[PDB]
Amino acid sequence: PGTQMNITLGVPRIKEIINASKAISTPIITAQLDKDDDADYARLV
Amino acid sequence: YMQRRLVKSLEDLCSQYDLTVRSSTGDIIQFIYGGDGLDPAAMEGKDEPLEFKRVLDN
Amino acid sequence: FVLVEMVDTVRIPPWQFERKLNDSIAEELNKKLANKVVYNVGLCICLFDITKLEDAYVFPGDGASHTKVHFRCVVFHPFLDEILIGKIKGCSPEGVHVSLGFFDDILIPPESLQQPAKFDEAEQVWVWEYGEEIRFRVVDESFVDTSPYTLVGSISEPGLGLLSWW
Amino acid sequence: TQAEIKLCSLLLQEHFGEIVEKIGVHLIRTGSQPLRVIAHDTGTSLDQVKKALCVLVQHNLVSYQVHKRGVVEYEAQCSRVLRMLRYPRYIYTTKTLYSDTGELIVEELLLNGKLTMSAVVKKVADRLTETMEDGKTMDYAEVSNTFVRLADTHFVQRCPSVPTTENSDPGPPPPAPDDGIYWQANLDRFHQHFRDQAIVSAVANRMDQTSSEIVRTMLRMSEITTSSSAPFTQPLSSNEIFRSLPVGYNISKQVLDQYLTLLADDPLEINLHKALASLATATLESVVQERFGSRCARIFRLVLQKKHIEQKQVEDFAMIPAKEAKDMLYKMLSENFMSLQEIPKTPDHAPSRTFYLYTVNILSAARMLLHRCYKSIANLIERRQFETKENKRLLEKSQITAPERQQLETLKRNVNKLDASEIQVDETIFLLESYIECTMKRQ
Amino acid sequence: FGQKDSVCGVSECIIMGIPMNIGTGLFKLLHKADRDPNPPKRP
Amino acid sequence: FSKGEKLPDVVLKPPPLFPDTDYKPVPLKTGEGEEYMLALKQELRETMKRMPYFIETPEERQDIERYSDWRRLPREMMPRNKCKKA
Amino acid sequence: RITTPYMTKYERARVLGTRALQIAMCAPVMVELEGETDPLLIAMKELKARKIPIIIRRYLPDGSYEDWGVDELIIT
Amino acid sequence: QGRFRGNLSGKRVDFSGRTVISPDPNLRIDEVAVPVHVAKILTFPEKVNKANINFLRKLVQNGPEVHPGANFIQQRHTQMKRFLKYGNREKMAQELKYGDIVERHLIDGDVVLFNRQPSLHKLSIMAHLARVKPHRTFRFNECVCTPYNADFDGDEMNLHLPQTEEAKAEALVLMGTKANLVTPRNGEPLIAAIQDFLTGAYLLTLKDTFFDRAKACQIIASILVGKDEKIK
Amino acid sequence: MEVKDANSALLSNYEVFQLLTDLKEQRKESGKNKHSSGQQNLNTITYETLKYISKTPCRHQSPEIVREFLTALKSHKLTKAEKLQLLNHRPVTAVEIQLMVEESEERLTEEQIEALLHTVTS
DNA sequence: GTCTGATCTCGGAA
DNA sequence: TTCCGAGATCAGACGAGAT
Ligand SMILES: [Mg+2]
């Protein structure tokens, strides 16, 4: 299947995962909050 | 190239006869292959070997 | 004579799969170790018994069956204390040649120790007088391969007296 | 130091046996190793390893000590095993400094390793009486007199207290009354005394006969008050020099005092640091004299004069032609005597630099020649190992045709030419090894 | 280093020309012919 | 081509050689002891024997080796003339 | 007794692998064959009739083994 | 280019050919049509084993010019392969005994194995039974072309011929098309209808079509050749 | 073909002869001409070997005699090699035991040697 | 003609 | 006081096959 905001998704992502490099291009940490109902509180976080 | 690096590390694994998957040097990678010891090839859709609605109606 | 326990990997070709193994190994091992002196061991003759025959593998190539075979074979090896009885199949001026009867004509006695009437003077004189007995004295074998015989003996004749024949 | 280990394989093979060599030489090759690990790696049964270490601890070649695991790791000291080569020389200077009795004292002390007084005096009461006249029996009391007489000049020192660890067994080491206490020989005292003969022969064959004797009596009264690790001897006054002179001399105090300030001020310089440092270079110079003629030996002494002044003066300072000289430099370079060009400071260029200057380094030329002399005695013994097994047929015939006997007297000419030549290269070892030990700190 | 490698995997058994042990070379096969560890003769 | 002829030489002869059997007179004394102790170190108790010969021999039989004034008076003196260390 | 009682596809291949090469060296045939000249087609006739003189030596990877007759297995 | 990556792993191989492919739906999914000229060159050493003695005698009289024939005979003891072109074939036919090797031609029923050279997954090498057809193209069924990722626009693909009898069974059982119908990524089938067959069977199973016994027995009786001719 | 055990000798002449007599007559039952193009050295050694053993009149020699003679031998204290010589040599007369026999020195006594002649004759 | 971890030199600190 | 972080420079590699 390898032959077949911005996040890298293609072969340069899978090549980036298989190498397990220390520093990658576009590293993204998602985070859920305690109070996920108001844009102002998550503003503050 | 990514086919070449992948298969030049992953080639010497085989599920041994006591269901363990070991390296060539004897070291265990997986204790059962993939948790259930099941072929992905023979595996039915949804990663389940049966899909029981189809077999019962069959 | 002495038994010699030996271990060999005997290959039975696949057109002999009708016959029983312990017989069909024995037909091979006779063709492997007959009339052949083994270095530091002696002259193998035949097969005594197969004491342990283990399981018949079949390897990724040949398709034949390779059974590792423990056995015992009788060999010829004088014990340095045997008074044998042979026949003079030859006389050289340096020493007589005795031969055990149709066994091996390779026993060559040096002759220095019998009674002081000793010479072989090339007209086939056995001994200047006063079946033939023999005392096998030393073990002496030479490994043949050397580049890209072999059990010879030295054989003595002391003051036995030889009451029947001189 | 693989050629050193080549000799320890050769020295134990001729003296005791083969498995005591094998378990011995393996212990030199793998070091601090337990009893079970040695028997598993050499492929030797455990009953023979216990015997082989038992003979090896008797002759003080393998030393045992446990630290942490509660399991004793044996360890063989390498430089002791080569001292077996000097064994008949250790006999001889006890004949020049003591009688035939005390010469036999250091002999069976060197032979049977660890000895008590109650045994070694009992043994020489057998050997010296059987060679003396029956009825004129040698009295053993004179042996006990000369036995301590060796010990007051400290030629025989006692064994260090036994660890008595549980793994070690007391019954096996003694060979079968009083127990007593054991000792080996103090061969370290000999290495002073062999050095005492070395400096007194260095002065007498250079300065004068009367110069060397005052060096001897200086060193003979400085024996117990120093050790081998002393950088130089204990300082003396000239007044006890006149007291310690031998009775053969008649020289007045003031004339020898002129020779005393003459002998104190030399290029040779008693500075025991400078003494072995000057004697080692003459051993180097006697090897190039042995090998490359007096012409190359003339430029070999030239680099001992100037440290880094070379190839712009060596064609001038010896006046020999440029063709003949430069093959002597590169032969001194290729055989590692000339050491190297440690002055080039132009960056990374063999062609363009500040001109490479030759310079002898005395220790790299020392450690090589010691390694060479270790290699030399390997080629000596192996020849005497070679010529022995063939000729065994005619040694027992005396115990025979004309070429049969002629092979024996060409054998006995050969072996006696070999065995004498094992000792003449042996004196080069000690003369250089004592120089090696004199420049080695923290050991 | 004095590296003693055994010859395993597939990237070495292919190089050496040994039948690899991964897959069809994992097990090995016996033959089922007439055999037994027999009694010897009295000597 | 200048050297492409044969092995350089069977041996290279050095025009200068060894001096002699140096120190000729006095090593007659050490030189006999070289051969004296070697006659006695081999014939000592502190040696090993080839018991692998006897396990090699299955021909063991009887009649072969394979099958088969100190004039002194008592005293006791124990001296510490030596070191008191280690 | 602990491995799978199903003849794997790697065991069916090699049993047909060597029983073909055995029968191509004049082995005794166990199936009273009916004109098949390809030795491989004889061996599948040997497998379906369950007459193959072969015992699979299954190696557990510790070193212990476990034998299995080709009669004593469930082919597909 | 060095010996590791190209001479020890990726090494060139005897008994192997390469042509252009063209379709043939009239084969079973398990068969490749091999040209005659190739099948007279690629040879399989079939040893003589009491069941192919009369079959190899019958084909060694043909020799290397008629297709069911042979072109080399080793004797039972490493005698050099006897190029069966010059001598008397019938004298070699009668003298042929057990044990010795005949390098008979690539006949139908033999196991060759394809490869399309950019091999990207397990399914690019597949075994195939070999039927000697009359052309110089490798013709296979078009259902098995998406495993090869092979269109017929001038694509070439290689054909190896395994020599030992152990490597013949390892092709047939493990790598046969009847075994590898299913890719090992998903479990999906890769060998299934492509292009016209799909738009054929859609237009046939569409609700509007109706066949009379004229056309019905004509479409049905198309399915009666090649292991199917013996069914009622 | 490594030999694990170099020696283990109790094969008295009768034993080897008997094995050979069963073997010679048994090999011919399956005697093969297919293996002639291969091996024939075995035939020669067995054939000629039978004759040399035959020289000793083991013809009429019996299996029970081996134990029967052995029961007498254990009392004499002669070694196992000596007894094998005694059975294999089969000394016909006293002179061979008196002189030819091994370990004559000391153990002869002119007592059990005379008794041995009765035992050997038996 | 970059993409790469390794391995060398500087520097500010408890 | 030394030692570990952060500044430079250096590596080997960059698909099959085909004519
Ligand atoms: Mg295309």
PDB file of N, CA and C in Angstrom, chain F residues 16-79:
ATOM      1  N   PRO F  16      78.484  -8.327   8.745  1.00  0.00           N
ATOM      2  CA  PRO F  16      78.959  -8.570  10.112  1.00  0.00           C
ATOM      3  C   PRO F  16      78.095  -9.582  10.843  1.00  0.00           C
ATOM      4  N   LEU F  17      78.687 -10.294  11.792  1.00  0.00           N
ATOM      5  CA  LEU F  17      78.027 -11.419  12.424  1.00  0.00           C
ATOM      6  C   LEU F  17      78.151 -11.337  13.935  1.00  0.00           C
ATOM      7  N   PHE F  18      77.736 -12.425  14.570  1.00  0.00           N
ATOM      8  CA  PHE F  18      77.825 -12.578  16.013  1.00  0.00           C
ATOM      9  C   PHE F  18      79.287 -12.605  16.455  1.00  0.00           C
ATOM     10  N   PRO F  19      79.608 -12.131  17.669  1.00  0.00           N
ATOM     11  CA  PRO F  19      81.013 -12.100  18.100  1.00  0.00           C
ATOM     12  C   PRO F  19      81.669 -13.455  18.328  1.00  0.00           C
ATOM     13  N   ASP F  20      81.117 -14.245  19.250  1.00  0.00           N
ATOM     14  CA  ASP F  20      81.639 -15.544  19.664  1.00  0.00           C
ATOM     15  C   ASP F  20      80.600 -16.241  20.526  1.00  0.00           C
ATOM     16  N   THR F  21      80.977 -17.337  21.167  1.00  0.00           N
ATOM     17  CA  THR F  21      80.268 -17.754  22.366  1.00  0.00           C
ATOM     18  C   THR F  21      80.790 -16.932  23.537  1.00  0.00           C
ATOM     19  N   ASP F  22      80.232 -15.731  23.692  1.00  0.00           N
ATOM     20  CA  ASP F  22      80.792 -14.718  24.577  1.00  0.00           C
ATOM     21  C   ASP F  22      80.700 -15.160  26.036  1.00  0.00           C
ATOM     22  N   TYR F  23      81.592 -14.592  26.862  1.00  0.00           N
ATOM     23  CA  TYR F  23      81.923 -15.086  28.196  1.00  0.00           C
ATOM     24  C   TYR F  23      82.267 -16.563  28.100  1.00  0.00           C
ATOM     25  N   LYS F  24      83.370 -16.895  27.449  1.00  0.00           N
ATOM     26  CA  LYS F  24      83.721 -18.305  27.294  1.00  0.00           C
ATOM     27  C   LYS F  24      84.086 -19.063  28.587  1.00  0.00           C
ATOM     28  N   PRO F  25      84.997 -18.578  29.530  1.00  0.00           N
ATOM     29  CA  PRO F  25      85.499 -19.513  30.553  1.00  0.00           C
ATOM     30  C   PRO F  25      84.507 -19.940  31.634  1.00  0.00           C
ATOM     31  N   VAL F  26      83.928 -18.983  32.354  1.00  0.00           N
ATOM     32  CA  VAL F  26      83.172 -19.200  33.591  1.00  0.00           C
ATOM     33  C   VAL F  26      81.821 -19.889  33.368  1.00  0.00           C
ATOM     34  N   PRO F  27      81.031 -19.614  32.271  1.00  0.00           N
ATOM     35  CA  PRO F  27      79.822 -20.424  32.033  1.00  0.00           C
ATOM     36  C   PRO F  27      79.985 -21.920  31.782  1.00  0.00           C
ATOM     37  N   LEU F  28      81.183 -22.484  31.929  1.00  0.00           N
ATOM     38  CA  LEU F  28      81.277 -23.926  32.110  1.00  0.00           C
ATOM     39  C   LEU F  28      80.614 -24.346  33.419  1.00  0.00           C
ATOM     40  N   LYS F  29      80.600 -23.449  34.409  1.00  0.00           N
ATOM     41  CA  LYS F  29      80.017 -23.770  35.703  1.00  0.00           C
ATOM     42  C   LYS F  29      78.501 -23.731  35.636  1.00  0.00           C
ATOM     43  N   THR F  30      77.944 -22.661  35.065  1.00  0.00           N
ATOM     44  CA  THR F  30      76.495 -22.581  34.928  1.00  0.00           C
ATOM     45  C   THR F  30      76.001 -23.557  33.876  1.00  0.00           C
ATOM     46  N   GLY F  31      76.822 -23.804  32.851  1.00  0.00           N
ATOM     47  CA  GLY F  31      76.372 -24.578  31.710  1.00  0.00           C
ATOM     48  C   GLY F  31      76.149 -26.038  32.032  1.00  0.00           C
ATOM     49  N   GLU F  32      76.921 -26.582  32.970  1.00  0.00           N
ATOM     50  CA  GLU F  32      76.653 -27.946  33.401  1.00  0.00           C
ATOM     51  C   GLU F  32      75.408 -27.997  34.273  1.00  0.00           C
ATOM     52  N   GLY F  33      75.165 -26.934  35.044  1.00  0.00           N
ATOM     53  CA  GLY F  33      73.992 -26.902  35.902  1.00  0.00           C
ATOM     54  C   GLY F  33      72.711 -26.735  35.112  1.00  0.00           C
ATOM     55  N   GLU F  34      72.809 -26.096  33.940  1.00  0.00           N
ATOM     56  CA  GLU F  34      71.728 -26.074  32.957  1.00  0.00           C
ATOM     57  C   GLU F  34      71.273 -27.481  32.622  1.00  0.00           C
ATOM     58  N   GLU F  35      72.242 -28.376  32.449  1.00  0.00           N
ATOM     59  CA  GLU F  35      71.940 -29.752  32.088  1.00  0.00           C
ATOM     60  C   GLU F  35      71.790 -30.623  33.328  1.00  0.00           C
ATOM     61  N   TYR F  36      72.280 -30.145  34.474  1.00  0.00           N
ATOM     62  CA  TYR F  36      72.206 -30.945  35.692  1.00  0.00           C
ATOM     63  C   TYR F  36      70.802 -30.931  36.271  1.00  0.00           C
ATOM     64  N   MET F  37      70.233 -29.737  36.451  1.00  0.00           N
ATOM     65  CA  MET F  37      68.892 -29.644  37.016  1.00  0.00           C
ATOM     66  C   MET F  37      67.849 -30.174  36.047  1.00  0.00           C
ATOM     67  N   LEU F  38      68.101 -30.051  34.744  1.00  0.00           N
ATOM     68  CA  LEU F  38      67.182 -30.573  33.743  1.00  0.00           C
ATOM     69  C   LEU F  38      67.185 -32.091  33.753  1.00  0.00           C
ATOM     70  N   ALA F  39      68.300 -32.685  34.187  1.00  0.00           N
ATOM     71  CA  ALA F  39      68.310 -34.113  34.463  1.00  0.00           C
ATOM     72  C   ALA F  39      67.522 -34.444  35.724  1.00  0.00           C
ATOM     73  N   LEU F  40      67.340 -33.469  36.613  1.00  0.00           N
ATOM     74  CA  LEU F  40      66.723 -33.759  37.902  1.00  0.00           C
ATOM     75  C   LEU F  40      65.329 -33.159  38.009  1.00  0.00           C
ATOM     76  N   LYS F  41      65.047 -32.097  37.247  1.00  0.00           N
ATOM     77  CA  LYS F  41      63.693 -31.553  37.237  1.00  0.00           C
ATOM     78  C   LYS F  41      62.735 -32.482  36.510  1.00  0.00           C
ATOM     79  N   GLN F  42      63.200 -33.115  35.434  1.00  0.00           N
ATOM     80  CA  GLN F  42      62.371 -34.099  34.749  1.00  0.00           C
ATOM     81  C   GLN F  42      62.191 -35.345  35.603  1.00  0.00           C
ATOM     82  N   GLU F  43      63.243 -35.766  36.295  1.00  0.00           N
ATOM     83  CA  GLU F  43      63.159 -36.906  37.198  1.00  0.00           C
ATOM     84  C   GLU F  43      62.942 -36.361  38.606  1.00  0.00           C
ATOM     85  N   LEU F  44      61.759 -35.798  38.814  1.00  0.00           N
ATOM     86  CA  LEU F  44      61.383 -35.218  40.090  1.00  0.00           C
ATOM     87  C   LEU F  44      60.002 -35.748  40.449  1.00  0.00           C
ATOM     88  N   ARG F  45      59.578 -35.474  41.675  1.00  0.00           N
ATOM     89  CA  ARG F  45      58.203 -35.698  42.075  1.00  0.00           C
ATOM     90  C   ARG F  45      57.261 -34.632  41.533  1.00  0.00           C
ATOM     91  N   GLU F  46      57.751 -33.415  41.300  1.00  0.00           N
ATOM     92  CA  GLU F  46      56.917 -32.290  40.864  1.00  0.00           C
ATOM     93  C   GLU F  46      56.687 -32.294  39.355  1.00  0.00           C
ATOM     94  N   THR F  47      56.235 -33.424  38.823  1.00  0.00           N
ATOM     95  CA  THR F  47      55.952 -33.569  37.407  1.00  0.00           C
ATOM     96  C   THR F  47      54.683 -34.385  37.246  1.00  0.00           C
ATOM     97  N   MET F  48      54.174 -34.422  36.025  1.00  0.00           N
ATOM     98  CA  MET F  48      52.974 -35.186  35.750  1.00  0.00           C
ATOM     99  C   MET F  48      53.282 -36.321  34.782  1.00  0.00           C
ATOM    100  N   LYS F  49      52.390 -37.302  34.743  1.00  0.00           N
ATOM    101  CA  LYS F  49      52.599 -38.499  33.952  1.00  0.00           C
ATOM    102  C   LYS F  49      51.445 -38.650  32.972  1.00  0.00           C
ATOM    103  N   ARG F  50      51.696 -39.392  31.896  1.00  0.00           N
ATOM    104  CA  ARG F  50      50.696 -39.576  30.851  1.00  0.00           C
ATOM    105  C   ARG F  50      49.801 -40.749  31.232  1.00  0.00           C
ATOM    106  N   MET F  51      48.931 -40.494  32.199  1.00  0.00           N
ATOM    107  CA  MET F  51      47.752 -41.319  32.407  1.00  0.00           C
ATOM    108  C   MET F  51      46.822 -41.421  31.185  1.00  0.00           C
ATOM    109  N   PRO F  52      46.780 -40.454  30.243  1.00  0.00           N
ATOM    110  CA  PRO F  52      46.187 -40.773  28.936  1.00  0.00           C
ATOM    111  C   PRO F  52      46.828 -41.918  28.156  1.00  0.00           C
ATOM    112  N   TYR F  53      48.061 -42.335  28.446  1.00  0.00           N
ATOM    113  CA  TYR F  53      48.566 -43.554  27.816  1.00  0.00           C
ATOM    114  C   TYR F  53      47.873 -44.787  28.375  1.00  0.00           C
ATOM    115  N   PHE F  54      47.607 -44.799  29.682  1.00  0.00           N
ATOM    116  CA  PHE F  54      47.064 -45.994  30.319  1.00  0.00           C
ATOM    117  C   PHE F  54      45.572 -46.144  30.046  1.00  0.00           C
ATOM    118  N   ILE F  55      44.868 -45.034  29.815  1.00  0.00           N
ATOM    119  CA  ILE F  55      43.475 -45.144  29.395  1.00  0.00           C
ATOM    120  C   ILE F  55      43.409 -45.457  27.902  1.00  0.00           C
ATOM    121  N   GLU F  56      44.500 -45.190  27.176  1.00  0.00           N
ATOM    122  CA  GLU F  56      44.590 -45.592  25.779  1.00  0.00           C
ATOM    123  C   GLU F  56      44.892 -47.077  25.646  1.00  0.00           C
ATOM    124  N   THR F  57      45.550 -47.663  26.656  1.00  0.00           N
ATOM    125  CA  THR F  57      45.979 -49.085  26.554  1.00  0.00           C
ATOM    126  C   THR F  57      44.873 -50.049  26.994  1.00  0.00           C
ATOM    127  N   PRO F  58      44.284 -50.857  26.084  1.00  0.00           N
ATOM    128  CA  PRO F  58      43.309 -51.886  26.460  1.00  0.00           C
ATOM    129  C   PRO F  58      44.044 -53.233  26.485  1.00  0.00           C
ATOM    130  N   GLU F  59      45.378 -53.213  26.390  1.00  0.00           N
ATOM    131  CA  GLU F  59      46.182 -54.466  26.316  1.00  0.00           C
ATOM    132  C   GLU F  59      46.778 -54.801  27.685  1.00  0.00           C
ATOM    133  N   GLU F  60      46.224 -54.248  28.769  1.00  0.00           N
ATOM    134  CA  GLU F  60      46.834 -54.448  30.111  1.00  0.00           C
ATOM    135  C   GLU F  60      46.990 -55.947  30.393  1.00  0.00           C
ATOM    136  N   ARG F  61      48.174 -56.361  30.860  1.00  0.00           N
ATOM    137  CA  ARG F  61      48.426 -57.789  31.199  1.00  0.00           C
ATOM    138  C   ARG F  61      49.550 -57.868  32.242  1.00  0.00           C
ATOM    139  N   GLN F  62      49.702 -59.022  32.918  1.00  0.00           N
ATOM    140  CA  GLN F  62      50.691 -59.181  34.029  1.00  0.00           C
ATOM    141  C   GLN F  62      52.119 -59.376  33.511  1.00  0.00           C
ATOM    142  N   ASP F  63      53.123 -59.024  34.326  1.00  0.00           N
ATOM    143  CA  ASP F  63      54.553 -59.131  33.905  1.00  0.00           C
ATOM    144  C   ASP F  63      55.035 -57.903  33.123  1.00  0.00           C
ATOM    145  N   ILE F  64      54.226 -56.843  33.040  1.00  0.00           N
ATOM    146  CA  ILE F  64      54.685 -55.589  32.368  1.00  0.00           C
ATOM    147  C   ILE F  64      54.572 -54.436  33.372  1.00  0.00           C
ATOM    148  N   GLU F  65      55.347 -53.364  33.181  1.00  0.00           N
ATOM    149  CA  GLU F  65      55.335 -52.214  34.121  1.00  0.00           C
ATOM    150  C   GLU F  65      53.925 -51.616  34.148  1.00  0.00           C
ATOM    151  N   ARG F  66      53.263 -51.533  32.992  1.00  0.00           N
ATOM    152  CA  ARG F  66      51.861 -51.039  32.951  1.00  0.00           C
ATOM    153  C   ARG F  66      51.050 -51.726  34.059  1.00  0.00           C
ATOM    154  N   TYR F  67      51.382 -52.981  34.393  1.00  0.00           N
ATOM    155  CA  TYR F  67      50.651 -53.726  35.451  1.00  0.00           C
ATOM    156  C   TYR F  67      51.278 -53.417  36.816  1.00  0.00           C
ATOM    157  N   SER F  68      52.612 -53.354  36.885  1.00  0.00           N
ATOM    158  CA  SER F  68      53.310 -53.096  38.173  1.00  0.00           C
ATOM    159  C   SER F  68      53.623 -51.602  38.313  1.00  0.00           C
ATOM    160  N   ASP F  69      73.783 -42.264  54.646  1.00  0.00           N
ATOM    161  CA  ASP F  69      73.238 -42.790  55.891  1.00  0.00           C
ATOM    162  C   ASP F  69      72.542 -41.687  56.678  1.00  0.00           C
ATOM    163  N   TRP F  70      72.612 -40.461  56.143  1.00  0.00           N
ATOM    164  CA  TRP F  70      71.915 -39.272  56.648  1.00  0.00           C
ATOM    165  C   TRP F  70      72.351 -38.951  58.083  1.00  0.00           C
ATOM    166  N   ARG F  71      73.668 -38.916  58.270  1.00  0.00           N
ATOM    167  CA  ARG F  71      74.265 -38.801  59.598  1.00  0.00           C
ATOM    168  C   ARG F  71      74.030 -37.401  60.149  1.00  0.00           C
ATOM    169  N   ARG F  72      73.184 -37.309  61.176  1.00  0.00           N
ATOM    170  CA  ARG F  72      72.689 -36.019  61.626  1.00  0.00           C
ATOM    171  C   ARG F  72      72.255 -36.120  63.083  1.00  0.00           C
ATOM    172  N   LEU F  73      72.250 -34.971  63.758  1.00  0.00           N
ATOM    173  CA  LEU F  73      71.854 -34.873  65.162  1.00  0.00           C
ATOM    174  C   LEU F  73      70.728 -33.851  65.310  1.00  0.00           C
ATOM    175  N   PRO F  74      69.776 -34.118  66.218  1.00  0.00           N
ATOM    176  CA  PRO F  74      68.628 -33.218  66.409  1.00  0.00           C
ATOM    177  C   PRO F  74      69.019 -31.848  66.951  1.00  0.00           C
ATOM    178  N   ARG F  75      68.201 -30.857  66.599  1.00  0.00           N
ATOM    179  CA  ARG F  75      68.276 -29.455  66.999  1.00  0.00           C
ATOM    180  C   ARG F  75      66.994 -28.785  66.525  1.00  0.00           C
ATOM    181  N   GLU F  76      66.702 -27.603  67.068  1.00  0.00           N
ATOM    182  CA  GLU F  76      65.522 -26.846  66.632  1.00  0.00           C
ATOM    183  C   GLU F  76      65.764 -25.356  66.875  1.00  0.00           C
ATOM    184  N   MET F  77      65.966 -24.622  65.785  1.00  0.00           N
ATOM    185  CA  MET F  77      66.088 -23.173  65.804  1.00  0.00           C
ATOM    186  C   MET F  77      65.226 -22.615  64.684  1.00  0.00           C
ATOM    187  N   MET F  78      64.267 -21.764  65.039  1.00  0.00           N
ATOM    188  CA  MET F  78      63.369 -21.128  64.078  1.00  0.00           C
ATOM    189  C   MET F  78      63.648 -19.628  64.049  1.00  0.00           C
ATOM    190  N   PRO F  79      64.354 -19.147  63.026  1.00  0.00           N
ATOM    191  CA  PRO F  79      64.741 -17.735  63.013  1.00  0.00           C
ATOM    192  C   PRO F  79      63.773 -16.847  62.251  1.00  0.00           C
TER     193      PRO F  79
END
